[PDB]
RNA sequence: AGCAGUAAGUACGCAUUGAUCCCUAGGUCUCCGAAUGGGGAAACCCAGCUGUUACUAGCAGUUAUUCAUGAGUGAAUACAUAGCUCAUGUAAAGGUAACGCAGAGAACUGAAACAUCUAAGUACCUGCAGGAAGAGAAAGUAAAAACGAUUUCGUAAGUAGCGGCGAGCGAACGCGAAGAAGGGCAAACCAAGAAGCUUGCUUCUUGGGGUUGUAGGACUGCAACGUGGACUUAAGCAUUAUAGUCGAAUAACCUGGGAAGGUUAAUCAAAGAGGGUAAUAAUCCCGUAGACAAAAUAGCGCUUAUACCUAGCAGUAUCCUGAGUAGGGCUGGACACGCGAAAUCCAGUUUGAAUCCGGGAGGACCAUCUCCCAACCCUAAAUACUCCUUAGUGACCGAUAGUGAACCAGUACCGUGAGGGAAAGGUGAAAAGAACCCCGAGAGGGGAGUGAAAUAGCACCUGAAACCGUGUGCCUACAAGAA
RNA sequence: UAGCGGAGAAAUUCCAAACGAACUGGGAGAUAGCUGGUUCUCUCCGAAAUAGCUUUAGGGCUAGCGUCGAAAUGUAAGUGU
RNA sequence: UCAAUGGUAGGAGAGCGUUCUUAACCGCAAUGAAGGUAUACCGUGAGGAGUGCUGGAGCGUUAAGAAGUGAGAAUGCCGGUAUGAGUAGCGCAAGAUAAGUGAGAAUCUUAUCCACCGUAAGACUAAGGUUUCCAGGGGAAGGCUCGUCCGCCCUGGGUUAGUCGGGACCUAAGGCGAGGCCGAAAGGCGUAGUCGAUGGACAACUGGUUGAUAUUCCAGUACUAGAUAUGAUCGUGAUGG
RNA sequence: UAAAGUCAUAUCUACCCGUACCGCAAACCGACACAGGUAGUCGAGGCGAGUAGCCUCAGGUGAUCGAGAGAACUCUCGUU
RNA sequence: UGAAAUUUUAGUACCUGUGAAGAUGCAGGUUACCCGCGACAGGACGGAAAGACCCCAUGGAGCUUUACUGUAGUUUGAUAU
């Protein structure tokens, strides 16, 4: 996508329907590691920077396809960007149009 | 080899009584003559029958 | 007994030194050969 | 909107202010290498000159050769000449995918052997060229009215032919289709000059003249047509590569680790191509169809005067029209053509015309007729092939395949060398890669936990097969079997 | 000093663990009357191993010997007794 | 009903199975496709499905088309596994004990004896090797066995010149060769010239020094050559001789 | 030919490459930690002409699977 | 510590016969508790060596010659120079 960004819907997989913050997708990885979504957990050795470990909850990223940005109002669809303003303006389909 | 006598000692090939398939190499005529000073002075190579047609054109050409 | 190759480093080359190789309009051709496959090098 | 290639892997950091990135142009461009100041084995050494700036430095450039063009020099020997010196011009040497052309050019074969043939003028090798090359404007074919440069394809058709007439090789004509452009010069002459100025010169330089077959030009007449053709210049126009941009149309339930699968419904429409998404999507995303976008970017094309040389025409004073040239002898070769009745063309060698009342061709050749005008030069187009650039397409192929090479392949490795030449992809969706605890020198294991799953644990999907096993019910330790 | 070659106190001796004609690439998957190999299932029918020629005799070419189809059935030929 | 059904090379006919087939026809699929595995079914055959289990993505139908299309067998090939066989060998010489080391010692280290070579099995030095050297650490493979050891592996250091060897000197044998020569071409020859050491030219040698470099680092002595600083004086004196 | 020369004098300089190790060898060339090959220079004493022996210099080395048991046999050795 | 060659698999005896004309495996008959272990060689027409002897191929190489064809080379003559 462009930018995430928000509260982000997650419709199909393994937690359906879950909305959670982002900000650090990293479009590279084609799959965005969301708060609250895909909760991976690491059994880490007690080694530096976590001198017990066993426990990392870290989250695993899922897919574009499973990423679905809402509007502000909590409405998700496509994204038709780029229509109005000086750059871009985001939004999505039947939306609250905000960004 | 001589250059205004056109081409060189060009290959070719020899037939015999009941022909045995063979090879000829074709030599032209080889003569050093330096003949005109138009402003010549050259000594090159040349070829008899452009001997016999020095006077054909051939004291510049 | 004695084998073939005990050489030094005069005997390693000049025989297949890049201007050896190179000379004769010969090796350079076949070394061209070796350009347009393109081995692990060339000269050697 | 994160960046901080590969990828872990780290750090200072860096960045919607506009980064990272994409494209275009410019920059610098280590050394070697055509490699070139000189030598030299490839990654070198040693220089000279000119300024620099300082040093028994460094910097920056110049210094290979051949050719061409000038300039100077000036031996035997006076001028000269050779020769030498300097200057200018990548010119140009060189690398090359495939096609071409040209030279040089076999054998093996086959012919049931084989000396003729064939293979083929092919394998190779060398040179010369471009995007194509050659190719070409009748000194043609043909045989009656018969056309009118070439080129490619089909046809004729294995037809005509040739050939130890074996084995084979092999046309052309005419027709059909594509493609369809011809134009200069020397010559003759005319004018200028200079000069054999030995005067009248009869050679050179310049510009007109005109490029010819039913002859044509020069001499007497006498007409301005765009033209790659009578200028394939420059200026605008337009649009394409060269950055990409937008870009529609959906929800729930059941299942499962996960829906796009089943079920329930709804939408869209220049987009239900295709690919991802944990499990098969039109409506999730990339996209897709369409619709926009480029300054520089390499172009293509259109309009413009210009970028320049041509016409008809009657007559015929004489000249011209392509000399060692045609031809003839001999030796070759190609042409279907193997010397033959042998055409016809091109070679060596020898001899050698005519020249417009001309000359040539019409498969020996002599007459009549038909056609043409060589012996001077250029000619796009239709064609051949791709290393390449994408746009792609597959009753291609799925890891012994498919490129030798899906993998750091021409790799490893062999060989001194020329050369040769391997093997190998898949965990899981996601490393979420097994914290901890215990055994163990360690590895490795075992619990725990991980994940949908741990026979799933790093060469990891799936797992036969030979091999080795461990357990298992029966039988065999008086037996000499294709079991 | 490099293969149509070389070297050679010479045997046919050697020319890079190696030669009466070296090694590498192409011609060229040279060729091979000689050797071997040939892969799914059924049914029906069913051999020869001889003559003649042949640079032919361990191979071909006919003819005799099978099979299937078609045209009639020399108006029966065939084959017996 | 009657008659036929040995059958090789031979010839004829017919059918099965695999894969791709956009075709359609028309399904299956996570409640489990394919594939594997056991299976005590059926089919004249080839062959076909049923179930149990693995297994977690494509496969099946039908009918027809098209085929790199039906696998034993060739010194077939490639890849794996036997076998012989716990047998051969364990690569030409003698160590020994104690102590350490470790977890584990024959084979690692030390001590102490023995032993061997000793015109060498010493030291030093060509070519060669191309870092193998040393230090520290480790033991996946390697070491023909073990292995804490190592030319094995990781990491880090280690080679020092006016005089040592070469080049900035010369040159043989030879090679290249502008000129030139001849040659289808490429070429091959070759004058000048050019490089080409194994040769001929020339100053440094004692002592110490590490884990390792020593003629190289430094103490002492030099000498060679040049430089700029400085009373020459006509001097240098060539590619010639 | 005038400090080109030139010596005194003074103090500096003197380039580039190679330099480690092994090298009769477990690094070379013999596919190998191989029973070959491989320059050259030195190369102890004691006898001893002797660089031949033979045992000890200096120096270096224990060279890589061993233990048993002493079969037959096989091969190197000593006898008759 | 640990290989090689090796092969249809085979729990592979003897006689006498038979037979592509010489048996382990066949017919008849005989003896043999089962499995080894150390040494040996008669077989298993033992391996390793698509016979290097002989023969054949319209096979090829090499060699020789007053085979036949040639070639260069050598030597005439013509003839441009």
């Known amino acids: ?99 | 080899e001589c250059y205004f006598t056109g081409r060189k000692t060009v290959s070719s090939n020899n037939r015999s009584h009941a022909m045995n398939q063979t090879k000829r190499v074709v030599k032209p005529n080889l003569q050093k003559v330096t003949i005109l000073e138009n402003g010549e002075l050259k000594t090159v190579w040349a070829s008899a029958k452009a001997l016999k047609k020095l006077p054909a054109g051939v004291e510049r050409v | 007994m004695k084998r073939t190759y005990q050489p030094h480093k005069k005997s390693r080359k000049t025989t297949h030194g890049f201007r050896s190789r190179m000379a004769t309009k010969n090796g350079r051709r076949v070394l061209a050969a070796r350009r347009r496959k393109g081995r692990a090098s060339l000269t050697v």
């Open chain 1, 1 to 99: 996508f462009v930018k995430t960004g928000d509260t982000v819907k997650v419709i199909a997989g393994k937690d359906r329907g879950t909305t959670g913050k982002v900000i650090k997708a990293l479009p590279k990885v084609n799959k965005v590691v969301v708060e609250g979504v895909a909760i991976m957990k690491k059994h880490q050795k007690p080694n530096s920077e976590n001198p017990s470990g066993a426990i990392l909850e870290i989250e695993a990223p899922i897919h574009v396809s499973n990423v679905q940005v809402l509007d502000k109002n909590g409405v998700a669809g496509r994204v038709g960007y780029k229509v109005v303003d000086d750059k871009k303006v985001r939004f999505n389909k039947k939306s609250g149009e905000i960004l």
